[PDB]
């Protein structure tokens, strides 16, 4: 916990040159078009362009700590806006091109983006979510729940119960929420395409779920500025900013990135919207 293993921190960044970057995003489009069941895996790299620092990037939390410096936030969690990548993931779900979303992120931005909570696994918890110890009812607050480590927040359950409410932030030694992990695992095993975005894949078992897509011959795409633990297992590795990658991809797919209305919570995925017809591939 003090000696908690933080993994490989501050590895050099890789940038694919523009011609290679454009060709690999075309190939990502081709894979997304061909796939029956697409699962996306997100880590802290998708929120860096909203001012929230990652863990192991050059100015990540743990990288900075190793060099006796502090991370820098350009936002509060409460004032953080969903990125282009966040909003692209909202649209890809609404048109049926995303089956499921697995996130290691605690920043609350997937939920706040409007992404349906029944297609999301929050493997490490949500800064804004408290849960009733008695009835298990979750509350999605407009401000961060002021405790970490699954502690009493001081609030009681209002279900029609008075149970103690606790944060959902795992400490190092805590095991993952059984529901979120079971659904992530089932989605990842059944996917024929898993796309990782802004995760170094160093944390077990979170970082290993994408590998489960490989069994029964599924494909694995890794989008990341640094090397990741499983780069060897990728069919496609794209070294670029996830916003540049996801906006080119959406343009290839003929989709617009929708407007963010401010913080909104969707419990259940709505019926699928229309999508463009598919290109002839080959
Ligand atoms: N805009 C960007 N575009 C692409 N890659 C990016 C960008 N910004 C950052 N990266 C990359 O994004 C990657 C982010 O990797 P890590 O910092 O390990 O975050 P995790 O989500 O995997 O951390 C998992 C858990 O570990 C913690 O202990 C907590 O418990 C976390 O929940 C880096 O390789 C960056 O190069
Ligand atoms: O709780 C904080 C926080 O959430 C993170 O939850 C993690 C559990 O996956 C713990 O591993 C960390 O210890 C913790 O930094 C984060 C955090 C940092 C970078 C992110 O990309 C992020 O999504 C949150 O930063 C903090 C900085 C502080 O000075 C005080 C804090 O309480 C936090
Ligand atoms: Zn309750």
UniProtKB/Swiss-Prot annotation:
Effect of residue 77 to Q: Slightly reduced MDL-800 and MDL-801 compounds-binding
Cofactor(s) this protein requires: Zn(2+)
Record's comment on post-translational modification: Acetylated at Lys-24. Deacetylation at Lys-24 by SIRT1 promotes homomultimerization and binding to double-strand breaks (DSBs) sites. Deubiquitinated by USP10, also preventing its degradation by the proteasome.
Notes on how activity is controlled: Compared to the defatty-acylase activity, the protein deacetylase activity is weak in vitro, and requires activation. The histone deacetylase activity is strongly activated upon binding to nucleosomes and chromatin in vivo. Two molecules of SIRT6 associate with the acidic patch of one nucleosome, while the C-terminal disordered region of SIRT6 associates with nucleosomal DNA, leading to efficient histone deacetylation. The protein-lysine deacetylase activity is also activated by long-chain free fatty-acids.
Mutagenesis or variant effect for residue 51 to A: Does not affect the NAD-dependent protein defatty-acylase activity. Abolished NAD-dependent protein deacetylase and mono-ADP-ribosyltransferase activities
Outcome recorded upon mutating residue 278 to A: Does not affect ability to promote DNA repair
Inducing factors: Down-regulated in a number of cancers, such as pancreatic cancer or colon carcinomas. Post-transcriptionally regulated by miR-766. Expression is post-transcriptionally repressed by miR-122.
Site feature: Formation of an covalent adduct with nitro-fatty acid activators: 9
Residues binding NAD(+): 44, 48, 55-56, 62, 104, 124, 198, 200, 224, 226, 242
Substitution effect: residue 16 to N: Found in non-small cell lung cancer; somatic mutation; reduced localization to chromatin; reduced histone deacetylase activity; does not affect the protein-lysine demyristoylase activity
A biological process from GO: base-excision repair
Positions carrying Phosphothreonine: 278
Keywords: Acetylation, Acyltransferase, Chromatin regulator, Chromosome, Developmental protein, DNA damage, DNA repair, DNA-binding, Endoplasmic reticulum, Glycosyltransferase, Isopeptide bond, Metal-binding, NAD, Nucleotidyltransferase, Nucleus, Phosphoprotein, RNA-binding, Telomere, Transferase, Tumor suppressor, Ubl conjugation, Zinc
Textual note on the cofactor: Binds 1 zinc ion per subunit.
Localization of this protein: Nucleus; Chromosome; Chromosome, Telomere; Endoplasmic reticulum
Effect on the protein of changing residue 54 to Y: Found in non-small cell lung cancer; somatic mutation; does not affect ability to recognize and bind double-strand breaks (DSBs) sites; strongly reduced histone deacetylase activity; strongly reduced the protein-lysine demyristoylase activity
Composition bias type Pro residues, residue spans: 271-280
Domain Deacetylase sirtuin-type: 18-256
Function as written in the Swiss-Prot or TrEMBL entry: NAD-dependent protein deacetylase, deacylase and mono-ADP-ribosyltransferase that plays an essential role in DNA damage repair, telomere maintenance, metabolic homeostasis, inflammation, tumorigenesis and aging. Displays protein-lysine deacetylase or defatty-acylase (demyristoylase and depalmitoylase) activity, depending on the context. Acts as a key histone deacetylase by catalyzing deacetylation of histone H3 at 'Lys-9', 'Lys-18' and 'Lys-56' (H3K9ac, H3K18ac and H3K56ac, respectively), suppressing target gene expression of several transcription factors, including NF-kappa-B.
Name of the protein in its database record: NAD-dependent protein deacylase sirtuin-6
Species for this entry: Homo sapiens (Human)
Gene name in the database record: SIRT6
Entire-sequence positions represented here: 13 to 298 of 355
């Amino acid at each position: 916990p003090f000696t908690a293993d933080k993994g490989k921190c501050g590895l050099p960044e890789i940038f694919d040159p523009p011609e290679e970057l454009e060709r690999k995003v075309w190939e990502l489009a081709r894979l997304v078009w061909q796939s029956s069941s697409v699962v996306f895996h997100t880590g802290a790299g998708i929120s860096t362009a909203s001012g929230i620092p990652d863990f192991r990037g050059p100015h990540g939390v743990w990288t900075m700590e190793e060099r006796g410096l502090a991370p820098k936030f350009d936002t509060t969690f409460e004032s953080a806006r969903p990125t282009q990548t966040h909003m692209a993931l909202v649209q890809l779900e609404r048109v049926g091109l995303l089956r499921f979303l697995v996130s290691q992120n605690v920043d609350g931005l997937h939920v706040r983006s409007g992404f349906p909570r029944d297609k999301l696994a929050e493997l490490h918890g949500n800064m804004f979510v408290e849960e009733c110890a008695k009835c298990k009812t979750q509350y999605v607050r407009d401000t961060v729940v002021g405790t970490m480590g699954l502690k009493a927040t001081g609030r009681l359950c209002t279900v029609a119960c008075r149970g103690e409410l606790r944060d959902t932030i795992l400490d190092w030694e805590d095991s993952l929420p059984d529901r979120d992990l079971a659904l992530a695992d089932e989605a990842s095993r059944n996917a024929d395409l898993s796309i990782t975005l802004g995760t170094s894949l160093q944390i077990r078992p979170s970082g290993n779920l994408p590998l489960a897509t490989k069994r029964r011959g599924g494909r694995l795409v890794i989008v990341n500025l640094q090397p990741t633990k499983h780069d060897r297992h990728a069919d496609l590795r794209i070294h670029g900013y996830v916003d540049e990658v996801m906006t080119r991809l959406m343009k290839h797919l003929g989709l617009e990135i929708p407007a963010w209305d401010g913080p909104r919570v969707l419990e259940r995925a709505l019926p699928p919207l229309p999508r463009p017809p598919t290109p002839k591939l080959e």
